[PDB]
Amino acid sequence: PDPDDGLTFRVLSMHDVRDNLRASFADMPDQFAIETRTLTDLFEWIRVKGFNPISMQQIIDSRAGVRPLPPRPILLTFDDGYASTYTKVFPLLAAFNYPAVVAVVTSWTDAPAGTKIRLSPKIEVPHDFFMTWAQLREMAQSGLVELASHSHNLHRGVLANPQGNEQPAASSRQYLPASGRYENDAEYRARVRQDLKTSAHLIRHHTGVTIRSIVWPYGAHNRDTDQVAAEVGLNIGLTLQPGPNTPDVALTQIRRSLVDYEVN
């Protein structure tokens, strides 16, 4: 298995099965014949197998050669910013003293008061399904949680072609019905840049936190989005490619595994 070198780490992205919005357009990693366990049981598995959950700060420090990672290091991440992240996950993180990354879709968290969040063309959810800014700031101030961008409004599908086939918003040059054309490279870069910039500003404004990482929705990213993320200062990126993060893996291309859980 993985070399124990104070540098190589695994990342585990946790998804609550009751937030069942998975996407057609997205090309997610295979989940078939993988057992869904409870979150508490997951935290107990982590412990008993000898994993040592680490923070993003610890990753950065190991790369800079200041402090090596502990053995069997793992990064836990919780994206999308649903309310259960605060009421269920947060007190377990505290009880086990495990750090985590929480990645915020800021157009969801920051939606106008009294309005519903549209997730898909046929699905809207109440504003209060999501953690409040005050709740996120509290997690950030606990010392246990690193806040990250899950984009502002890239956590959805956009039109890839005239008929109606969808692709992830961040990856594709989107087709514009009003223009009668696709986005050009300049337009595309501008849209993704403004999105990332907005999510970082909103997070800093409301929590005081300067983020330094992006968790790409649906693992969708490319050369252009990585370059643009770098321009806005987000030099840490998390993908859906699985595998060990060995020293030759750039922190812009962090690998992670996806696992589903149930809460009680």
Footprint of Ni ion on this chain (CB under 5 A)? 79-80, 205
- Amino acid 155 reads H
Residue 98 has a CB neighbour count (10 Å cut-off) of 20
Is 67 or 205 the residue whose CB approaches Ni ion more closely?
205
Is 79 or 146 the residue whose CB approaches Ni ion more closely?
79
Q: Cα–Cα distance between 197 and 234 in angstroms, integer?
A: 9
Is 47 or 205 the residue whose CB approaches Ni ion more closely?
205
Q: Cα–Cα distance between 172 and 26 in angstroms, integer?
A: 11
Q: How far is the CB of 143 from Ni ion (least distance, A)?
A: 24
Is 22 or 67 the residue whose CB approaches Ni ion more closely?
22
The closest residue (CB) to Ni ion is 205
Q: Cα–Cα distance between 115 and 107 in angstroms, integer?
A: 12
Please check whether residue 49 is in contact with residue 2, taking contact to mean a CB–CB distance below 8 angstroms: no
- Per-residue b or e along 43-74, where b marks 16 or more CB atoms closer than 10 Å to that residue's CB: beebeeeebebbbbebbbebeeeeeebbebbb
- Amino acid 196 reads L
Q: How far is the CB of 118 from Ni ion (least distance, A)?
A: 15
Q: How far is the CB of 250 from Ni ion (least distance, A)?
A: 22
Is 80 or 166 the residue whose CB approaches Ni ion more closely?
80
Q: How far is the CB of 259 from Ni ion (least distance, A)?
A: 14
Q: How far is the CB of 4 from Ni ion (least distance, A)?
A: 31
Q: How far is the CB of 79 from Ni ion (least distance, A)?
A: 4
Please check whether residue 200 is in contact with residue 211, taking contact to mean a CB–CB distance below 8 angstroms: yes
Please check whether residue 256 is in contact with residue 77, taking contact to mean a CB–CB distance below 8 angstroms: yes
Is 7 or 26 the residue whose CB approaches Ni ion more closely?
26
